[PDB]
């Protein structure tokens, strides 16, 4: 029945740095951008094809949207942005280096930070380098103050990432319409582990590929038939 | 004054072979994308913001907002995409040079057909080279019968694009929403005619300049204080 794909964002300018971005809208490195272009050819030569588009609003994941739908000539396909598909908030890890994030924090905090499902990094601070460029930047007018986080844990990624797949995707795909999702990897797990029933450690253990198409094969009530492929 | 801002994309791949392309999907070329980074950098450099974008359904319009978008850093702005913003649709003019639309029609149709504002030129039938590849692309698969063009008069145009004008862009507008169009010369013929109340000679006489950020300060009524003012 149903064809799903997803595409996880490559490498940003931030990732050159070392540097947590999170909410930060830090651009594609260039290599990011060279994934881009693989996975779009990759969707070239199997001949997929799409009938919506699902990013969020941050321009590593939209870029590398743009680059998909140029590689296979679908640029005219209608795109839908939500705050709801943007990366994890690593809160006032946000800039930070890992030296600067383990001379700050010290090595227990960021173990436990970096193992757990549901503790969260430390908030994003009116004080902090980058709260102005985030938290007041205006694309964010919209949010209430309650759902502009100022720092997430993995479940509450997935926890707002959700209702835009349940409220948003879901009826797009009952439709029969194709849909193609360019997002982040850790919003992206938060579909994968909806599809599959998958529990909190294996979704964790999950490195989803980045700039590789991953494809689902669905049956009528979304379930699916098979594991993940990677094109 | 509500501030509306419109720019006209640059030159194609069928410019540089002198083709007529109306609705085939020709690409910008390099020039023309120099010129959208150009019309980027204009608004940039003025200080513009946006709150919604529109283009068509057409990669060389698509490709101009992608890059104004880019130039300006507003790449997470919302883009809606319509057929009703395209270029006019040439007809079996499609692909046709200078030379051969003379041969084949004769000067006395090609000057009715360039200087008037009602005659249409000849339509696109089944066995013209791109009948297939513009009447049967799929992203114009939800047009009726009776909407899909055969070819476009410039009333025909602004006739379909105007429609998209006060179901889609004026409701921003009221709202209060900066909105920026990156379309095509004759459909935006069609928004300015509207505006200024312009002839249709003093429209069809109306060169818009391409790549240039072209300006209106609108009334209440959304009717403009002044005449459009290029940046
Ligand atoms: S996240 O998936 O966007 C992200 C950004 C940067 C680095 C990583 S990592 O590969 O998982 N390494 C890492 C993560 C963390 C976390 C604290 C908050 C949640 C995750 C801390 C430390 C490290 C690290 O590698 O230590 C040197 C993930
Ligand atoms: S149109 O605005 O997209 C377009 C494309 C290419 C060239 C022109 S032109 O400069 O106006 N010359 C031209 C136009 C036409 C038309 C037939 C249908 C509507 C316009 C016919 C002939 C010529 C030409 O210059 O013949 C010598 C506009
Ligand atoms: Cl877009």
Known sequence: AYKLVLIRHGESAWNLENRFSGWYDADLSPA??????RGGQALRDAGYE???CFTSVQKRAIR???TVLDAIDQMWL???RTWRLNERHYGGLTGLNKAETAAKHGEAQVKIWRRSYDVPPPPMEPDHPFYSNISKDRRYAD???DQLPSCESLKD?????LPFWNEEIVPQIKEGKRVLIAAHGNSLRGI???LEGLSEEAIM???LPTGIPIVYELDKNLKPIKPMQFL
Do not use: Q, S, Y
């Open 64 to 66: 590398t949207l743009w």
């Open 32 to 37: 990011g951008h060279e994934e881009a272009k």
């Open 205 to 207: 253990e999950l490195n």
């Open 157 to 161: 990624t997935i926890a707002r990432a």
């Open 143 to 145: 949010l209430t103050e």
């Open 192 to 194: 994968v582990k909806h």
């Open 50 to 52: 799409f009938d919506i």
């Open 78 to 80: 209608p795109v839908v």
